[PDB]
Amino acid sequence: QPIDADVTVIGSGPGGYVAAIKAAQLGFKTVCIEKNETLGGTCLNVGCIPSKALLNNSHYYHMAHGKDFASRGIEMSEVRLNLDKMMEQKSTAVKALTGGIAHLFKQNKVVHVNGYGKITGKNQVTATKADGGTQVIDTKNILIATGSEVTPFPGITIDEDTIVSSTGALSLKKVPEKMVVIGAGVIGVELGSVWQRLGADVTAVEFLGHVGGVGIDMEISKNFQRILQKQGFKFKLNTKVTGATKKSDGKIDVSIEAASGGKAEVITCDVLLVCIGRRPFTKNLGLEELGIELDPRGRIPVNTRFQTKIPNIYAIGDVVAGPMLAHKAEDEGIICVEGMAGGAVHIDYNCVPSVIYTHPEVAWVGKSEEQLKEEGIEYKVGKFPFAANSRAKTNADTDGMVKILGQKSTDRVLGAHILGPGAGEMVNEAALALEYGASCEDIARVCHAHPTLSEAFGEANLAASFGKSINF
Amino acid sequence: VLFQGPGADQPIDADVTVIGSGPGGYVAAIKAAQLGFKTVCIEKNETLGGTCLNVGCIPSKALLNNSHYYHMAHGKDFASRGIEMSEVRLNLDKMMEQKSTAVKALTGGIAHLFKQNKVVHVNGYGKITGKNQVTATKADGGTQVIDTKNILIATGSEVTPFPGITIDEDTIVSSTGALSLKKVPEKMVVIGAGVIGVELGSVWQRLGADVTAVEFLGHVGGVGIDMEISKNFQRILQKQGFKFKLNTKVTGATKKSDGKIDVSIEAASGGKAEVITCDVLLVCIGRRPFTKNLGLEELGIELDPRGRIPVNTRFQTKIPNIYAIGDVVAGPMLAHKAEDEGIICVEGMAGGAVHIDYNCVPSVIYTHPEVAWVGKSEEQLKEEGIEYKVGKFPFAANSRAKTNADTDGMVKILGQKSTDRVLGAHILGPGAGEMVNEAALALEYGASCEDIARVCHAHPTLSEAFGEANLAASFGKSINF
Ligand SMILES: Cc1cc2nc3c(=O)[nH]c(=O)nc-3n(C[C@H](O)[C@H](O)[C@H](O)COP(=O)(O)OP(=O)(O)OC[C@H]3O[C@@H](n4cnc5c(N)ncnc54)[C@H](O)[C@@H]3O)c2cc1C
Ligand SMILES: Cc1cc2nc3c(=O)[nH]c(=O)nc-3n(C[C@H](O)[C@H](O)[C@H](O)COP(=O)(O)OP(=O)(O)OC[C@H]3O[C@@H](n4cnc5c(N)ncnc54)[C@H](O)[C@@H]3O)c2cc1C
C-alpha cells in the first residue's frame, strides 16, 4: 500500500501548501502530509487570518462606538458589542480559506495525507494517523515545511485558560477586565490593540526599549508607541518579568522589575498573554537518525537551493533562517520547487516587507536608519506627513508619515518606512521599487493617482531626491 | 508682499507667471519657485486649488468615504461583525460639514505653501496683454501689470452645458450642486454615466435616493475603460440598486407644477420614447477646456476644434515663451495628469528634459468597489494589432479580501504574447486606487508579468491579487485560483 511520489511536502502552511501546488503545476507527482485537522498551517488557523479579522472588526467597533462615525453624520443611539458574533465572523473566514486550500489540492492533483510525518529513510516518509495506522510514501524528494511553535517563557506555564498564547488570545470568550501582554513585538501589539478596543485595560511589558520587534526603524517605533498610548494602550518598556502566579481566585499576579535591575513590583490581571517569540518546529521528524543537525536556534541549515546536507531533502519557511513571515515562506516554497526542476533560485530578504495591522498601520522594507549607520552607509532622508496628503485629509485619518532613506552617491532607495493609513498595501509598491533597484527620483516621477495615499510615498521620495516636497 | 489683492496695483516683474491655481497651476508655481524662478500665480476665485480642491476630487471623495461608512453601518455589514446598533440615522448637515472642513484645510494649506516658497499670489482675472505681459483685473476694478519672461496657462475646465436644459443648481444641478444638496432626493436622474456621474450617483443611492443614470453610449465609466471591466462594474452597481439606461439620448427636461422634473428620453438610434420623472436632475455629460477672455485670439493662438490649446512636447504654444498644461490641453482630464505636466513644464523652462508617458497615467473611480487602470485595454490592443495574453485573479480568492468579507471583482493583466511585457493593468475591487500605482511603477520600467509575480507582496494584502494575476499571465496559472 505505499504511495510513490516525486515530491513529498511535510506541512501545509504558507510554505508547504504553496510549494505543493507549484510542484504539481511543474509536473511533479506531489504529496502533502499534514497532522492537523485542516490545511493552511499557523497563518490560516491560529495566525495571520484570525488576527487580521479581529483587527478589522475591532477597528470598526471603535469607529462606531467612539467619535468617528458621529463626526461624519452617521448617528447611532446605542452601539453594543456581541463578541460571540464577532468571533463567528472570524471563524467563517478561516473555514472558507481552509476549505479553499483543500479544493486547490484537488484541482492541482496534490495528494493529501492526514497524519504525523516522520522521515524514515533518505527516500521515505511515513505518516502515522491518530489511530496509529501508517501510510508510507516512497519519494524522490522531501520538502520539510514543518513551521514554528510559540516560544515558552521559562517558569510560566501557558494553559490557554487564564495564561494564553496568541492562540488562546484569538478566542477569548469574554473581554477581560485587565490584560497583561508579555512582549511588545508585532503579535503582542496587534492582539493587545484588539482587546483594548473591545474594552480591556491593556498593558504590554517589554524587556527592550521599543515596540514593534526586530528591524523596525527607531523613529517610526517611537512615534507609533506615542500614538498607541494616546489610544489607551499602556506600555512598560525596559522591564523584565520574573514570574507569574495563578491565584486561587482565578486572577494572575505578575512580578516585574526594571530590565537593568530593581524597581520590583507586582501587577494583577485577569488574562496574561505570553508572546515573546516563536521558534522552529522539527519535533520527531527523524532528523537525528539521518544526521541532519540543527543550528543553535533550532533552524535547519540549508544551501541556496534550500537543500539540507542530504541533497534530496529540503527545508523552507519558519523552520529555516530569515524573517518568520507568511509571504517569505510562500516564496521560498515556490523557488525551492522551481530549483528542483532545474531553474534558478532567488529571494532577497532585504526586499521582504513587514506589516503591523494596527490602526494606524506600520509597514517597512529595506534598511532602517540604525542598520545603515551600523553598516557605515552615507544616506539621506526624505519625510512626508499624512497630514499633508489629500486623501488622508479628505478621509479625516491623518496620523503618521512616510520616511525614505536614499543613497547619497546614486539616489538609490535603501529603505521605506510607513506609519499611517494604508501602510500595509503601500509597502508593496516599495517592495517593487527595491526589487527593481529604483532611485528616489524614479518614484517621485511616477504619476501617482490623485487623491491617493500613495502620493505621500511619491512626495517623501521627492524630498529625498530633490531636497523638498511639493505639498510640505 | 506675497499677496496682491484689491488695492495692490503696482507693476510686477516675474520670470514665470502662472494663470490658474488648480492642480496643474499651483504645483507648477511651487516647483518653479523651488527651481529659482521669481514666480507669480494669478487666481480669480476666492480660494486656491482649482476645480479639484473646491468642487471636484476632494469634496466628492469625502462624500464617497462617508456614504460608504453609512452603508456599512445602516446595512448588513456591521451587524455581521458583532457591532450591534439600535438605530442608524443620517445627519446630512454633519456629513456635509466634514466635507467642507477638509476642503477648507486643504485650500488654506496651498496659501501657506505659496508663502513658504515665496510665490506671489495675485487675486484677480488674468488676461494676456502682450507676449511678455499679463494684466490682472481685480474685484474693485483695479488692474495690475505683470512683466514676465514666461507665461504658463493653467486655466482648467468648466462643465459642458446641455442644450435646452438650464442648470440652476436648485433642482437641475451640475456636479457642484450635487455635492451640496440639502436633502436626499427621493428620485434622481443622472445624465452621463462617466466617472463623475457614477461616483455622485452612488453617493446619493447609498444615502437613500432612487438613482438612474442615462447614457448615450453603450457602457459606463467613460473613455478608455476596458469593456469587460466596465460590464462587470455595471452589474455590481445594478445589484447595489443603481439603475442604468444605456444607449439612450435625452431629448429634453421640463420642471413641473408639482416641483418634479419630467425627462424625455429615446433610444440613441431612434424610437422607444419614454418619460422618466425625478426630484433632482444631475447634468454631467462632460467637462471642457476654459479659456474665456484670456487674450488668445489677439495673440494668434488658435484653439483646436474641442477648445484645447495646441502645445508641443515641451508644452510650448506656437508662441515659444507661452506654455499651457492641464485640463486646457489634450490628454486625460485628471488632477495628477495636470500636476505632472506642470512640474515637467517648469523643469523644461529651467533647462531640463521634458517627457511624460500618458500610457503610464492611471485612472481611478472611487466607488465601492473601486475601479482603476493604467496602460492599454483589450480593445486598444486589438485595434493596434498587438498580440497579447490575459491573466485574471478574483478578489474572492484573496485572503485579505475574504477575511474582511469584501470580495467583489478581480485583477486583469494584459501581457505581450512573445515578451511577457506588462501592457495594461485593470483592477475592479477593494483598494484598486492605491494598487494601480504599483502597476504604474512597473510600466515606467517596462517590467514583465514575471517581474511582478516574483515581488514578495506582503501576506495578507490585496496586492497579492495583483501578483497572482501577473503570475497567471506569465506562467499560465496562479497559485490560489
Ligand atoms: C498570531 C500570529 C499572527 C501572524 N500574523 C502574520 C501576518 O500578519 N503576516 C505574516 O506574514 N505572518 C504572520 N504570522 C506568521 C506566519 O503565521 C508564519 O510566518 C507562517 O505561518 C509560516 O509558514 P510555514 O509554512 O513555514 O509554517 P506553519 O504555518 O507553522 O505551518 C507548518 C505546518 O506543518 C505542520 N506540521 C509540523 N510538523 C509536522 C509533521 N511532522 N507532520 C505533519 N505536519 C506537520 C503543522 O501542523 C503546520 O500545519 C503570524 C503568526 C502568528 C502566531
Ligand atoms: C466632481 C469632480 C470630481 C473629480 N474627481 C477627480 C478625481 O478623483 N481624480 C482626478 O484626477 N480628477 C478628478 N477630477 C478632475 C480634476 O478636478 C481636474 O482634472 C483638475 O482639477 C484639472 O486641473 P487644472 O489645474 O488643469 O485646472 P482647474 O482645477 O480647473 O483649475 C483652473 C483654475 O484657473 C482659474 N482660472 C481660469 N481662468 C483664469 C483667469 N483668466 N485668471 C485667473 N484664474 C483663472 C480657475 O478659477 C481655476 O481655479 C474631478 C472633477 C470633478 C468636476
Burial of B69 (0-12, 13-18, 19+ CB in 10 A): buried
B158 lies within 8 A of chain A by CB: no
Phi, psi of A116 (to 5 degrees): -90, 115
Alpha helices in A66-109 (DSSP H): 68-71, 83-107
- State in Å: Cα A14 to ligand 1 middle: 7
CB spacing of B477 vs A25 below 8 angstroms: yes
Phi, psi of B155 (to 5 degrees): -85, -5
A52 lies within 8 A of chain B by CB: yes
Determine the Cα–Cα distance for residues B31 and B187; give it in Å rounded to an integer.
46
Alpha helices in A284-387 (DSSP H): 287-290, 326-340, 369-375
Among residues B74, B355, B426, B459, which one is catalytic?
A: B459
Angle subtended by helix axes A83-107 and A14-25, to nearest 10: 30
Q: 10 Å Cβ neighbour count for A398?
A: 18
Distance from CA of A49 to the nearest CA of B (A): 7
Annotated catalytic residue B459: yes
* Residue B334, annotated as binding a ligand: yes
* Cβ-contact B366, B61 below 8 angstroms: yes
A429 and A445 both lie in a single domain:
yes
Residues in A closer than 8 angstroms to B111, CB to CB, are none
The structural domain count of chain B equals 1
Residue of minimum CA distance from atom 53 in ligand 2: B56
A162 and A71 both lie in a single domain:
no
Alpha helices in B75-156 (DSSP H): 77-80, 92-116
A433 and A364 both lie in a single domain:
yes
A404 and A425 both lie in a single domain:
yes
Length of chain A: 472
Distance from CA of A372 to the nearest CA of B (A): 22
* Secondary structure of B296-318 as H, E, C letters: HHHHCCCCCCCCCCCCCCCCECC
A249 and A335 both lie in a single domain:
no
Which residue reads 443614470 in cell numbers? Answer: B213
Distance from CA of B151 to the nearest CA of A (A): 20
**CA B319 remoteness from chain centre:** 30
Determine the Cα–Cα distance for residues B427 and B144; give it in Å rounded to an integer.
49
* Residue A168, annotated as binding a ligand: no
Q: How many H helices and E strands in chain B?
A: 15, 25
Residues in A closer than 8 angstroms to B436, CB to CB, are 449
Give the list of residues 6+ apart from residue B282 with CB closer than 8 angstroms, or none. B173, B174, B175, B177, B178, B188, B189, B190, B191, B197, B200, B201
Between chain A and chain B, the number of residue pairs with CB atoms below 8 A apart is 274
Give the list of residues 6+ apart from residue A368 with CB closer than 8 angstroms, or none. A215, A216, A217, A218, A405, A415, A417
Give the list of residues 6+ apart from residue A198 with CB closer than 8 angstroms, or none. A58, A61, A81, A83, A175
| Selection from A22, A372, A438, B110 nearest residue A446 by Cα | A438
Final residue of a structural domain among A258, A276, A294: A276
The pairing of beta strand B143-153 with beta strand B133-137: antiparallel
Most B-contacting residue of A354, A394, A441, A461 (CB-CB within 10 A), to test interface? A394
Give the list of residues 6+ apart from residue B239 with CB closer than 8 angstroms, or none. none
Give the list of residues 6+ apart from residue B5 with CB closer than 8 angstroms, or none. B122, B123, B124, B138
* B window 412-471, beta carbon within 8 A of A: 431, 433-438, 440-442, 444-445, 447, 451-452, 454-464, 466
| Selection from B239, B195, B62, B44 nearest residue B124 by Cα | B44
A312 lies within 8 A of chain B by CB: no
Which CATH number is A368's domain given?
3.30.390.30
Q: 10 Å Cβ neighbour count for A422?
A: 25
A334 and A264 both lie in a single domain:
no
A2 and A127 both lie in a single domain:
yes
A307 and A174 both lie in a single domain:
no
- From the list B89, B364, B458, the residue facing A75 with the nearest CB is B89
A62 lies within 8 A of chain B by CB: no
- Looking at chain A, which residue has its C-alpha nearest residue B58? A394
Report the amino acid identity of residue B149: K
| Selection from A240, A234, A268 nearest residue A254 by Cα | A268
Task: Supply the DSSP symbol for B186.
Answer: S
Which residue reads 470580495 in cell numbers? Answer: B407
* Cβ-contact B196, B284 below 8 angstroms: yes
Which CATH number is A175's domain given?
3.50.50.60
Report the amino acid identity of residue A296: P
| Selection from A57, A257, A251, A16 nearest residue A147 by Cα | A16
Determine the Cα–Cα distance for residues B288 and B156; give it in Å rounded to an integer.
8
* Residue B333, annotated as binding a ligand: yes
Task: Supply the DSSP symbol for B128.
Answer: E
Q: What is the number of the ligand closest to the CA of A32?
A: 1
Task: Supply the DSSP symbol for A257.
Answer: E
* A window 326-385, beta carbon within 8 A of B: 326-328, 330-331, 334, 346-347, 351-355, 363
- From the list A85, A354, A396, the residue facing B82 with the nearest CB is A85
CB spacing of B364 vs A452 below 8 angstroms: yes
Residues in A closer than 8 angstroms to B87, CB to CB, are 76-77
* Residue A188, annotated as binding a ligand: yes
B73 lies within 8 A of chain A by CB: yes
- From the list B88, B98, B403, the residue facing A396 with the nearest CB is B98
A44 and A64 both lie in a single domain:
yes
CB spacing of B83 vs A82 below 8 angstroms: yes
Task: Supply the DSSP symbol for B236.
Answer: H
B34 lies within 8 A of chain A by CB: yes
- Ligand 1 atom at shortest distance from the alpha carbon of A166: 1
Distance from first CA to last CA of chain A, Å, rounded?
70
Buried b / exposed e across A265-276, counting CB within 10 Å, b at 16+? eebebbbbbbbb
Residue of minimum CA distance from atom 33 in ligand 2: B20
- β-bridge partners, A236: A205
CB spacing of B441 vs A445 below 8 angstroms: no
- State in Å: Cα A142 to ligand 1 middle: 18
CB spacing of B65 vs A394 below 8 angstroms: yes
A353 and A411 both lie in a single domain:
yes
- State in Å: Cα A393 to ligand 2 middle: 19
- Looking at chain B, which residue has its C-alpha nearest residue A426? B434
Determine the Cα–Cα distance for residues B339 and B327; give it in Å rounded to an integer.
10
Final residue of a structural domain among A248, A276, A304: A276
Alpha helices in B370-431 (DSSP H): 378-384, 399-403
- From the list A74, A427, A454, the residue facing B70 with the nearest CB is A74
Residue of minimum CA distance from atom 30 in ligand 1: A147
Cell of A46: 491560529
Cell of A387: 497630514
A343 and A440 both lie in a single domain:
no
Residue of minimum CA distance from atom 45 in ligand 2: B20
Domain span at residue A72 reads 1-150+277-348
Angle subtended by helix axes A48-65 and A186-198, to nearest 10: 40
Distance from CA of B86 to the nearest CA of A (A): 6
Final residue of a structural domain among A348, A365, A381: A348
Residue of minimum CA distance from atom 13 in ligand 2: B57
- State in Å: Cα B335 to ligand 2 middle: 7
* Cβ-contact A81, A198 below 8 angstroms: yes
A117 and A230 both lie in a single domain:
no
What separation in angstroms does the CA of B318 have from each of A203, B300, B301, B302, B305? Answer: 68, 9, 7, 9, 16
- Looking at chain B, which residue has its C-alpha nearest residue A75? B89
